[PDB]
């Protein structure tokens, strides 16, 4: 059965508050395809909070979802809480109305999601709120359906559930391109440097959390991009090593310049997650900022390291780049090697983390940069 | 009506705990000019958390303000709790005589600041406890209040209350003066070198949580200076660049020492918010610590970057400072140039952020560095 | 006598995720020696939280220990929560039986510790659990005894008590040992340079906090290493300089490698508090980590600073690591000199804070780096 916790209204606004008013899955409540049939979709027993409200799913099947008459449609399953219902006391025992499992179409789950709307709100309180945890593609008539777990809504980071790491990685090692401008790919896949004269993709360790980004989906972007999906004031940290630099050799050492820059560029609507609408960042907003601004010093390797706190927004790209002149006789700090015996980017790793807000007056005075 | 939420003391000592003992308005409450006149002060309707008491303001004029008699004085506007009081419970609804909307005195508000006295504390309990709203400097008779919102009790860094960022800045560009010791101006005016021979006074985007710094009100100090609202252990981040360094041309490279140092100084007493007493560091407290500390490398630009932890105390200033020698032939890493010509910080910012605290016994065994 | 804040399960699940699942002693709780005697042990008056339970000491004695017939051995005194007994409400006025100030050796202790299990455990819910104090050596009958406080069972970092700052310490100077691989002293003894010839053993400031990480007991690693007491990912930022590096004189300047790692090593099982079993991490777990490897550059001194974010086991040593070649002629950052002429790091320093947790599936995502 379906039951409530703590379920009035007050004590739900201080446990809200308490969860840095993030709602999720504390505990389990993933899909059960040994108990699910072509009639019904079987949940494994978890916890859950959503805007203060403690759910929880009480052993096989521990709660079964009716499908019936659910064919050929992507849809999303999803935990509601509804105070316009009332929860039944047979048996001085309890029912719970007020809380439902149930299938929603994207518009929909939108207009009553939790992230976007409340129970509790200022401006606009709703009595209607909803979490969604699959995607659940229906297929024909008499066959099981297909699932995708919405990860954001799952709690599992935790002290600080709103805040904390968005997305790390492990050191790798990454070829520079002959290009003045060029990103600096984050996502899980480099260009390895691995003979003196080739380089080849290779995977490298990486984690995102999915509540704060995600990858993007585009093609021209997948190796590079992240999408923003929480506004925030957030810190990016990068170290690394620029190998095989060029210089022009003492005939003085002719250093030549290069910059580590991060950006973010809002010109694309509904990336985030569901296609939900950007959060518009204030009039004179950052796009680009330089890490670390240098010439190359004679060395065979030379570190860097930078930290900077930045403002990003819901629906946002996020992505680093890597600058310098094209002349490699005159002003490219890359060299006309390829492989090892090329210049590139040695022992490189980054972490994002979510550390402030953007909410009330933060939005204009901080938010700008 | 001025509502209590759940108006008893051992619950207030549990959310008090949940709100990282932080006391503060959480939503409005902020003046309401229209509605008030020269007998009265009108204040919008909001939601507050005095030491874990919810306190609610419930549609104009929200509540009203009492202001007959005042003039001719600088007073604070300031939402007191007082447990002495007993809440009427008149129609079996409540009254709430604990709670009162009042003006009050800087050493009166001082005596009973909820930062600096407890409802809940173990050594010296109290019974009476205030939070001020605004400065209200009441003109002469028949005419209406000026004021100034008291920004630290005011909550809008909402997750983790008590700590964050206290101060950030984006990049900017700033001119070194040919001397042996200077501050960096942190407070949002920098010496931005604009031709091959001059620099001008520009300003750059700057960000201050007033719970936790301000800036320093001494001409002399003001752009380079912060004085510390709240004890703890701070994180001082930097990055940027030393441009047109100056060093002996190989005729080797003859590098230049500098520095760039973080600063304490508790000196001044009172400088922290209604001129509370400064709170005295333990006895070895560190003044001075190096954050990048190397010679000019040859290059026209070099970069740093720098990452400490330091503890600061409620009063102090809190400053950088550029080190080097002073002749330009021998030992100083600035040259003979001005504007774009002469050495200068390029693409500099910071962030300091709260992060650890001093109680107990961290006080002697973290604090003194 | 032992009284309970609010003795119900419920409420406790919920105050225990807003303490982030840490317990401990809040205030007071300390031993009383002027009121201990041969067949009593006197504690002060305190109050403290054992997973979501509320524990208050309420005067001198505040709470009296029977010792009768303890002798000859080191024992653990406990508070403990036993959920089987039932608190008697005499006086319509409560004696506490739930509510437990005993002495324990280190196996019962371990199976009924709350760092390990829980009264609110999913898999394996206890009825039983328990926070030791101190170690108490009982010597021969008639003597009073000996007793360690056990401080990582002592909140007093409190905003967000499981995470925050696990070590840090004051800029120092080090000496570098003519050796291709060595640790970097961390745990507050450097080989400070004196002279033109000498370096000596110095003390610098340090802190650690106990429920993080502690020293590591060996010999070998005392001056080196931490033994991490908490699984999660941790933040570790280093900065300094390398100071008389030495390099190739033009004849070009012919850099020396060198790097800074930091270490994990699992090896030794039982280093964690109280011997207990070390965590094991994923399979293909990071070792090393580069966070600065560069050339020596030919100037006197040459800064560095790197930040990292890097996955930690309950039970890891954690090490830092200076690495270069041993030909000084040819490869080596090293000198031939010794004392202040001797190539040393200067002004170094760390932190290493606590800032993400490897629960669920971050295990396995985010644990392997
Ligand atoms: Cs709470
Ligand atoms: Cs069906
Ligand atoms: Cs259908
Ligand atoms: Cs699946
Ligand atoms: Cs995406
Ligand atoms: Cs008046
Ligand atoms: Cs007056
Ligand atoms: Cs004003
Ligand atoms: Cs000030
Ligand atoms: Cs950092
Ligand atoms: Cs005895
Ligand atoms: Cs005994
Ligand atoms: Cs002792
Ligand atoms: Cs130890």
């Known amino acids: 059965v379906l039951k409530g916790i703590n379920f009035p209204e007050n004590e739900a606004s201080i446990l809200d508050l308490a969860m840095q008013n993030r ?189 704060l980004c995600s990858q993007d989906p585009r093609d021209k972007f997948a190796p590079d991009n992240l999408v923003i999906e929480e506004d925030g004031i957030y810190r990016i940290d990068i170290s690394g090593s620029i190998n095989i630099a060029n210089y022009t050799f003492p005939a003085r050492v002719g250093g030549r310049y290069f910059q580590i820059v991060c950006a973010r560029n809002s010109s694309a609507n509904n990336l985030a997650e569901f296609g939900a609408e950007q959060h518009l960042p204030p009039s004179g907003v950052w796009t680009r900022r330089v890490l670390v601004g240098e010439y190359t010093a004679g060395m065979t390797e030379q570190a860097f390291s930078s930290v900077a706190t930045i403002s990003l927004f819901k629906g946002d790209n996020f992505f680093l780049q890597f600058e310098t002149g094209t002349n490699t006789s005159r002003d490219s700090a890359y060299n006309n090697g390829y492989g090892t015996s090329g210049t590139h980017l040695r022992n490189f790793s980054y972490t994002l983390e979510r550390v402030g807000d953007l909410n009330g007056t933060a939005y204009y005075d901080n938010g700008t940069f």
């Open 23 to 211: 709602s999720g899955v504390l505990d389990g409540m993933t899909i059960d395809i040994l108990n699910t049939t072509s009639n019904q979709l079987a949940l494994f027993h978890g916890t859950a909070v959503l805007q203060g409200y403690g759910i929880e799913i009480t052993g096989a099947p521990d709660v079964l979802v009716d499908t019936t008459g659910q064919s050929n449609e992507t849809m999303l399953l999803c935990l509601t809480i509804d105070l316009n219902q009332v929860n039944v006391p047979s048996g001085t025992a309890v029912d719970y109305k007020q809380i439902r499992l149930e299938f929603l179409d994207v518009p929909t789950l939108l207009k009553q999601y939790w992230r976007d709307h409340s129970l509790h709100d200022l401006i606009d309180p709703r009595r209607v709120i909803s979490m969604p945890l699959y995607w659940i593609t229906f297929g024909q008539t008499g066959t099981t359906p297909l699932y995708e777990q919405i990860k954001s809504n799952y709690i599992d980071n935790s002290g600080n559930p709103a805040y904390g790491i968005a997305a790390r990685c492990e050191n790798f090692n990454h070829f520079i391109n002959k290009v003045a401008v060029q990103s600096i790919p984050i996502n899980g896949v480099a260009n390895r440097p691995v003979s003196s004269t080739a380089s080849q993709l290779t995977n490298y360790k990486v984690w995102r959390n999915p509540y």
